[PDB]
Amino acid sequence: VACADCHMPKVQLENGKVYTSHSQRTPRDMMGQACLNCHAEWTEDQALYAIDYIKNYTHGKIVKSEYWLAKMID
Amino acid sequence: NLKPVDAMQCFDCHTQIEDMHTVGKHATVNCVHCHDATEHVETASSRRMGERPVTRMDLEACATCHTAQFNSFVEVRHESHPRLEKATPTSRSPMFDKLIAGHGFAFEHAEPRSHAFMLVDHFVVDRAYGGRFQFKNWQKVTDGMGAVRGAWTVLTDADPESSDQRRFLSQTATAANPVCLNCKTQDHILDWAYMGDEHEAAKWSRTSEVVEFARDLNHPLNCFMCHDPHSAGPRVVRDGLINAVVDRGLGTYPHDPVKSEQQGMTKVTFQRGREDFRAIGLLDTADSNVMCAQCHVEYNCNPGYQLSDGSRVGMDDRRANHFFWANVFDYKEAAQEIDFFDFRHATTGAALPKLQHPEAETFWGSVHERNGVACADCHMPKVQLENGKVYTSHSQRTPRDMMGQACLNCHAEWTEDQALYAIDYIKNYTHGKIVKSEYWLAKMIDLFPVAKRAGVSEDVLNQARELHYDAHLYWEWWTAENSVGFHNPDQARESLMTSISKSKEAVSLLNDAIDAQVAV
Amino acid sequence: NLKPVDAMQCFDCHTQIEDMHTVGKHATVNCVHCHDATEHVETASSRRMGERPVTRMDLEACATCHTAQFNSFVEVRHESHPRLEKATPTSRSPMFDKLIAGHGFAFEHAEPRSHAFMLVDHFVVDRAYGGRFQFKNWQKVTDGMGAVRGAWTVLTDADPESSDQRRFLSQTATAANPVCLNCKTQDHILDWAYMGDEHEAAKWSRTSEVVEFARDLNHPLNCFMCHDPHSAGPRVVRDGLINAVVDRGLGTYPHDPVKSEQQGMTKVTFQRGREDFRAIGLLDTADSNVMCAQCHVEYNCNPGYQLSDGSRVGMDDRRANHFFWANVFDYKEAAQEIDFFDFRHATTGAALPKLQHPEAETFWGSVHERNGVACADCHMPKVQLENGKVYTSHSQRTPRDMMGQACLNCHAEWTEDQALYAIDYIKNYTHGKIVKSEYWLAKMIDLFPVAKRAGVSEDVLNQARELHYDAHLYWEWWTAENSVGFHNPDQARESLMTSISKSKEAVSLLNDAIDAQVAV
Amino acid sequence: NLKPVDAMQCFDCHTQIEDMHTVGKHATVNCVHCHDATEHVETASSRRMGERPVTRMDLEACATCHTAQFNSFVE
Numbered sequence A: 001v002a003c004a005d006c007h008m009p010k011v012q013l014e015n016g017k018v019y020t021s022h023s024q025r026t027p028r029d030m031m032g033q034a035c036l037n038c039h040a041e042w043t044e045d046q047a048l049y050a051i052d053y054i055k056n057y058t059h060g061k062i063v064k065s066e067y068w069l070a071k072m073i074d
Numbered sequence B, C: 001n002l003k004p005v006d007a008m009q010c011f012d013c014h015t016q017i018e019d020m021h022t023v024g025k026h027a028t029v030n031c032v033h034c035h036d037a038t039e040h041v042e043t044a045s046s047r048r049m050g051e052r053p054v055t056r057m058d059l060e061a062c063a064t065c066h067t068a069q070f071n072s073f074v075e076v077r078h079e080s081h082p083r084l085e086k087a088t089p090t091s092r093s094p095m096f097d098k099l100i101a102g103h104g105f106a107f108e109h110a111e112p113r114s115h116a117f118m119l120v121d122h123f124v125v126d127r128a129y130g131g132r133f134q135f136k137n138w139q140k141v142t143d144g145m146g147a148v149r150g151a152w153t154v155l156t157d158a159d160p161e162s163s164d165q166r167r168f169l170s171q172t173a174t175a176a177n178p179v180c181l182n183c184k185t186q187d188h189i190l191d192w193a194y195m196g197d198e199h200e201a202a203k204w205s206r207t208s209e210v211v212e213f214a215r216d217l218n219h220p221l222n223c224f225m226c227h228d229p230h231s232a233g234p235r236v237v238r239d240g241l242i243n244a245v246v247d248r249g250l251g252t253y254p255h256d257p258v259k260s261e262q263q264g265m266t267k268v269t270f271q272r273g274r275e276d277f278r279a280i281g282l283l284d285t286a287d288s289n290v291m292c293a294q295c296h297v298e299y300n301c302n303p304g305y306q307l308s309d310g311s312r313v314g315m316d317d318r319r320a321n322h323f324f325w326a327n328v329f330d331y332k333e334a335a336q337e338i339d340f341f342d343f344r345h346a347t348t349g350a351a352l353p354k355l356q357h358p359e360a361e362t363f364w365g366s367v368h369e370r371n372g373v374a375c376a377d378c379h380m381p382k383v384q385l386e387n388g389k390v391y392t393s394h395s396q397r398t399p400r401d402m403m404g405q406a407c408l409n410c411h412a413e414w415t416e417d418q419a420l421y422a423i424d425y426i427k428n429y430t431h432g433k434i435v436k437s438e439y440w441l442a443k444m445i446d447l448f449p450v451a452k453r454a455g456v457s458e459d460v461l462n463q464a465r466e467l468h469y470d471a472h473l474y475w476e477w478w479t480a481e482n483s484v485g486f487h488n489p490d491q492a493r494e495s496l497m498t499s500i501s502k503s504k505e506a507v508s509l510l511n512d513a514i515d516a517q518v519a520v
Numbered sequence D: 001n002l003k004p005v006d007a008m009q010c011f012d013c014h015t016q017i018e019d020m021h022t023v024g025k026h027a028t029v030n031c032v033h034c035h036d037a038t039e040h041v042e043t044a045s046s047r048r049m050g051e052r053p054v055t056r057m058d059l060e061a062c063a064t065c066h067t068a069q070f071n072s073f074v075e
């Protein structure tokens, strides 16, 4: 998988000539084309939930990392 | 990958192309994008073609550099109901079968749908080819991109071994003829002489076997119908339109000589063996009124009969390819001018015209047309973007889908709901008069068998038939025209009231004659 | 609280029940859930019933352990318009009154609504019981759960003191008879002999007073119509269906002997005093095509007349309970096979069939049926859950409400709008041909009085009446069938074109005969 | 309106560009779309630039033929 698969995927059209989106942005804006096409087992809410599980856990450890760096700095 | 050819080598022979190509916005676009001419260059002389070069007519030839306009063009509007028969109580003409009896449209006449389907819909409608052509299956009806790629990628022919027009199912007709195709495709633009006259250099003409012609055609509404591929400048290619505007000298706006001069057309003719062969009309301005009038007009594209003596007018006659270029109040005179009518009513025996989608001629003289508004302003406006390069939408559809760009930009005093309400006030009032007109036409039509059977004289029946012509014209214009009066509401109202008046006159004439017979 | 009974004690006598109950998925479900048999056990012998045990027929007997399927079944689809008369310009059959004149359906024929209401709607429709039964007030029309709980909890009887069929309001009919109830309820499953034959052990039969029968019935579409309560295995209980498939040997799929073998039915018979009494058909597979064909078929459930001699066929005849089990192109032969027609047209005098909702026989041979798709796949699919135990929806309704589960799972190439567009293309085209068929039927019908009054001969009028039979059949199939052609579009198209052809033939015959009379 | 230049004349001194341009999917795209080299061509030799030609770096140089990619980019 590469950055473009999640952040600038091909446009999906009912009728038309396919081209590649050049709006590089979060996959949350185009989940059908950026995630759900590979993850058939998920609804959009399930895929968002899986993202947020990782970001929530990571951000918690960033905050704890800063708490300890700040305690040392002080 | 494409390799460019030496255009200067072409221009040595093709001076008209040189004059157009070197000056316009396609001066950097190489011939190889649309032509394969290698063997042609090896064999042509200054006056003889030699081997014929290949010319691409597919819309994807333009989609490579103009993807936004192409993608907009091929969109399917699913809200435009498909295969919706007009002769039903919930559509445009509840009493159409009774009123049109004797004409091929009684076999099927659906409402229009998105442009991508025009050629496939032409091929499959029940009135056209005896039911010979069908979609490969009922799922293909959704496939707009497929139809654009080519009719024969989504259709089947019930009998590839024969080329005659015949019925394959009982309730079909074989009304299609080569002239129809000119408003569905221009794939034949190099194979058709101006007006569809017989010509040594034309493979196809008005008198061709239409089933064989059909098989050679693939693409709907080619991009180059409105845009010259050499200059990229605005134009029309439709011979019937050029004939009305230029040859007959009627102008682009027959009611307005000044606007006709400012927004005119220059006929350019191309030859084969130094004899005139085909023509285009270059426009002074990018005027969509005239571009859309290549098809959205009342026309003849069919055999018929002479008003004077009732004799047959066949596909071989020039009248079988004709733009009347007349509003509803000038139409009867325009039909007298060429001594033509379309069919005899199956019940009344009256000589009648058949009217078709006269949007362009209806729009003339309307408040919007008089203020310089054109079809594209309401039906294919500029796209509005917060950040982006503006381009023109090519999805021709009702303004209800883009009211901000199609109406409310000029009508700043209205909300979207108020603008919709104004449109519906006109459509509701107009439809009510169409329905009343049909009621009166039907009442008259029903009296003909009663009058004949009661022994009413031919002289009286003929007087009623002359009234039927006018009652019919002044009604059918409005079921044929697609705006339900919006394009010209005062004209629709005056015309529909005239239809009713004529029918009432005919009813009174017939009732009195029947009553007198019974009294004897 | 329920206390279990000793099932082994029952099984001592009930060996058929034992063989079914001990093997299937209800082997742990005690008899007390559905039967109160204490006094029965005390008094029965191996061949005599003794006191009759109570058997629960209410759907709540199953709702205790299967709440999800019950709650799904009783949902009311408010978008399915209620009490919507089909004989209007905006519904299925704009010219129904003229075409059906002479038949009881002219008094009222509404579109179907949700299954919860089937029995109450049967009781209150204007054509059924002379207007005898009404909802307790106009608010009760919304109460689906109430109707399921029991018809008599939401209805009133205008005269509990009489049991005759009569008109209580002027524009009603009394078309109901005991056979109708078999497609509304199976509360009478233990009180009705197979086919509704007279039988010593049956309280009710084809010849019962229908008002008295009506009063004994409460619940719509019982869960056990498709599920054996003893084995929990798939089945049908409808006698007419078992008679077509098994007794007449036609099979579950008459056009396909192989599929008939793989997806067959085994007739199981239950006796009273060691004589055959009632029967069920156990299915080889959980095949909804055959389960839904207990009701969604063309049938006779009414008296009529013989084609051969015009004589009356009454409720006492087996033909008054009959599944034709024939597609539209085999129907005329199926009606000749039993020498039967339904009514004489009030205006033309023609012997005519009356067609009813033939969904099952229409679906045969369609692309979907040939690919192994069944009614439940589009009308009662598996529920899709992010997290949960999957069960089958029991809300039988249009797939438009669950397109992801009903269509788009098999048609991965389409969006919901594209799939809807494909359905509407078929429905629009089919409806247009229904409307044209009615136009031609009406034109013919209108000529009968004119022809009679002009002195046209009986021989010619009889030729026209024979044409009317076919014109009628090939049209009415499609206003009766609820998919507006979707279930089999090529068949609808061929049939409706045949209807039109027959009417046109009849119009020409009558016009020529009238013209000849006037000429003399 | 743009007027095409003689690309072959350019390639007499620009063999490295020739080998890329003639072979890829821009073989038909004339240099005038992105370069203004009139005075350069009047003054250059294969060994002396002469007047420096102008090269367009604006994204609109691509947006004429690739409006969809450009419009999606600038959102």
Ligand code: HEC
Pocket: A001, A002, A003, A004, A005, A006, A007, A025, A026, A027, A028, A051, A055
């Ligand atoms: C899908 C499997 C992904 C691939 C491959 C790449 N990225 Fe990604 N990225 C992804 C997610 C789910 C998120 C979080 C977005 C959210 O809304 O929570 C991101 C985030 C970014 C961001 C920040 C985007 C924003 O929140 O606005 C950037 C700048 C980004 N990613 C860049 C990026 C690059 C350069 C990649 C290839 C090396 C790449 N991503 C891969 C999902 C996916």
Ligand code: HEC
Pocket: A004, A018, A019, A020, A021, A022, D059, D062, D063, D066, D069, D070, D073
């Ligand atoms: C790197 C960050 C990019 C920039 C800056 C631009 N584009 Fe692009 N383009 C990019 C990728 C990863 C792809 C898809 C490649 C693949 O095959 O998967 C593209 C594709 C194109 C195309 C081809 C047609 C299509 O797939 O849409 C064109 C014509 C194209 N890109 C044009 C384009 C223009 C005009 C840009 C400036 C506005 C642009 N690209 C920037 C990566 C990158």
Ligand code: HEC
Pocket: B005, B006, B007, B009, B010, B011, B012, B013, B014, B031, B035, B037, B038, B040, B041, B044, B045, B046, B047, B048, B049, B052, B053, B054, B055, B190, B271, B272, B273, B274
């Ligand atoms: C003189 C020797 C010629 C050269 C070099 C080229 N063409 Fe030509 N062409 C020539 C003639 C005499 C004709 C017949 C029409 C006429 O003007 O008298 C043509 C025709 C074409 C057509 C129309 C083909 C058709 O199907 O009708 C096309 C598209 C065409 N020519 C293109 C073309 C191109 C692209 C050339 C350079 C590669 C070219 N021609 C060279 C005479 C001569």
Ligand code: HEC
Pocket: B025, B026, B029, B030, B033, B061, B062, B063, B064, B065, B066, B223, B224, B227, B229, B231, B232, B233, D064, D065
């Ligand atoms: C790329 C190789 C092209 C192909 C193939 C086609 N066109 Fe084109 N077109 C091209 C350019 C670079 C331009 C000029 C852009 C600018 O604004 O400077 C154009 C312009 C047009 C126009 C506008 C003309 C005008 O305003 O006077 C139209 C209507 C147009 N092009 C249409 C068109 C059609 C119908 C094509 C298929 C036959 C087509 N173009 C091919 C680049 C390319």
Ligand code: HEC
Pocket: B077, B080, B111, B112, B113, B114, B115, B116, B117, B118, B119, B121, B122, B182, B183, B184, B185, B221, B225, B288, B291, B292, B293, B294, B295, B296, B375, B376, B379, B380, B396, B397, B398
């Ligand atoms: C002949 C080649 C045509 C030209 C030029 C234009 N139109 Fe057209 N139009 C044409 C046909 C044959 C059809 C029906 C297609 C079918 O398969 O049924 C149409 C349809 C329309 C519609 C209805 C679209 C819908 O959503 O139902 C509109 C609004 C329309 N046409 C407008 C239109 C405009 C504004 C034009 C000039 C820009 C134009 N058309 C040109 C045939 C042709």
Ligand code: HEC
Pocket: B108, B109, B110, B111, B112, B113, B121, B122, B123, B125, B127, B128, B175, B176, B177, B179, B180, B181, B182, B183, B294, B295, B296, B297, B298, B299, B300, B301, B302, B357, B480, B482
């Ligand atoms: C240009 C002057 C036209 C000629 C010649 C033909 N048609 Fe046409 N057609 C035209 C337009 C502008 C439209 C859309 C507007 C409308 O009112 O329909 C159409 C539409 C069709 C359709 C779709 C609608 C329908 O009537 O079912 C069919 C099937 C169709 N046209 C067929 C047809 C045939 C068989 C023709 C020759 C007899 C014919 N068309 C000529 C424009 C023009």
Ligand code: HEC
Pocket: B059, B062, B063, B066, B069, B070, B073, B221, B222, B223, B224, B225, B226, B227, B286, B287, B288, B291, B292, B376, B390, B391, B392, B393, B394
């Ligand atoms: C007539 C019925 C048209 C057909 C067929 C096509 N286009 Fe068009 N185009 C049309 C109009 C009225 C306009 C606007 C002119 C104005 O100045 O108001 C356009 C414009 C273009 C342009 C210019 C850039 C823009 O404004 O979008 C291009 C590049 C263009 N059109 C391309 C194009 C292509 C590729 C088509 C086939 C898919 C096509 N046009 C058909 C009218 C008509």
Ligand code: HEC
Pocket: B080, B112, B288, B289, B292, B293, B296, B359, B360, B363, B368, B373, B374, B375, B376, B377, B378, B379, B397, B398, B399, B400, B423, B427, B482, B483, B486, B487
């Ligand atoms: C705005 C002032 C308009 C101009 C200029 C033109 N038309 Fe129009 N059209 C207009 C409206 C408000 C409507 C009714 C649409 C609705 O949804 O109620 C129409 C209708 C059409 C149609 C049928 C469209 C449909 O309902 O699907 C066609 C085919 C059409 N108009 C064509 C047309 C042409 C060819 C014009 C220039 C001659 C034209 N219209 C001008 C608004 C406006």
Ligand code: HEC
Pocket: C025, C026, C029, C030, C033, C061, C062, C063, C064, C065, C066, C223, C224, C227, C229, C231, C232, C233
């Ligand atoms: C609880 C005491 C029950 C009552 C009352 C009814 N049913 Fe039942 N059913 C019950 C169980 C425990 C099971 C098996 C669950 C499992 O999957 O193992 C069932 C099964 C069914 C089935 C599925 C049968 C099969 O797949 O072969 C059906 C169709 C079914 N039950 C229907 C049904 C009906 C119609 C009832 C009312 C007459 C009914 N059940 C009562 C538990 C209980």
Ligand code: HEC
Pocket: C077, C080, C111, C112, C113, C114, C115, C116, C117, C118, C119, C121, C122, C182, C183, C184, C185, C221, C225, C288, C291, C292, C293, C294, C295, C296, C375, C376, C379, C380, C396, C397, C398
């Ligand atoms: C006889 C006992 C029936 C069986 C078995 C099935 N159906 Fe039925 N259905 C029946 C009636 C009498 C009615 C009309 C009820 C009323 O009060 O009007 C219906 C209705 C439907 C509908 C329409 C529902 C709506 O929303 O309007 C559908 C879609 C339907 N029926 C489908 C259906 C299916 C798929 C069946 C097998 C699973 C089935 N029905 C069985 C009578 C009977």
Ligand code: HEC
Pocket: C108, C109, C110, C111, C112, C113, C121, C122, C123, C125, C127, C128, C175, C176, C177, C179, C180, C181, C182, C183, C294, C295, C296, C297, C298, C299, C300, C301, C302, C357, C480, C482
């Ligand atoms: C099974 C073979 C049936 C017999 C016997 C009867 N009906 Fe029926 N009915 C049946 C179905 C599958 C449906 C829904 C489909 C449809 O097209 O309606 C119905 C519907 C009704 C309705 C509601 C619709 C209406 O016509 O108003 C009523 C009032 C109704 N049925 C009454 C009725 C009477 C009086 C019957 C005996 C003469 C009768 N039905 C028989 C299935 C079956």
Ligand code: HEC
Pocket: C059, C062, C063, C066, C069, C070, C073, C221, C222, C223, C224, C225, C226, C227, C286, C287, C288, C291, C292, C376, C390, C391, C392, C393, C394
């Ligand atoms: C025929 C018209 C049916 C009626 C009446 C009832 N159900 Fe049903 N049921 C039906 C089908 C076609 C299926 C699916 C079988 C398959 O394997 O595809 C079902 C399934 C059940 C089940 C099994 C679990 C599940 O899949 O949901 C149960 C427990 C069940 N049905 C119960 C049930 C009850 C309680 C009913 C009365 C409210 C009922 N069914 C009616 C067909 C029919």
Ligand code: HEC
Pocket: C080, C112, C288, C289, C292, C293, C296, C359, C360, C363, C368, C373, C374, C375, C376, C377, C378, C379, C397, C398, C399, C400, C423, C427, C482, C483, C486, C487
């Ligand atoms: C999917 C491939 C289907 C199968 C298998 C069956 N039916 Fe169907 N039905 C289908 C569609 C797309 C429609 C039209 C619905 C719409 O909203 O347009 C229908 C319609 C019905 C109806 C009327 C439903 C309503 O509009 O309220 C009934 C009563 C019905 N179908 C019954 C039915 C039966 C009994 C089937 C098996 C024999 C059956 N259908 C198969 C889609 C599908």
Ligand code: HEC
Pocket: B028, B064, B065, D025, D026, D029, D030, D033, D061, D062, D063, D064, D065, D066
């Ligand atoms: C019209 C005169 C063009 C200008 C200016 C630019 N490009 Fe282009 N590009 C053009 C054509 C006709 C094609 C081939 C289309 C086809 O599919 O055959 C292309 C192709 C591209 C691609 C795809 C290349 C590949 O897949 O190998 C890209 C990424 C692309 N073009 C990018 C691009 C950029 C970044 C430009 C500005 C510097 C640019 N193009 C100008 C036509 C034209």
Ligand SMILES: O=N[O-]
Pocket: B164, B165, B208, B209, B210, B211
């Ligand atoms: O019907 N002649 O092609």
Ligand SMILES: O=N[O-]
Pocket: B356, B357
């Ligand atoms: O039938 N097309 O005007």
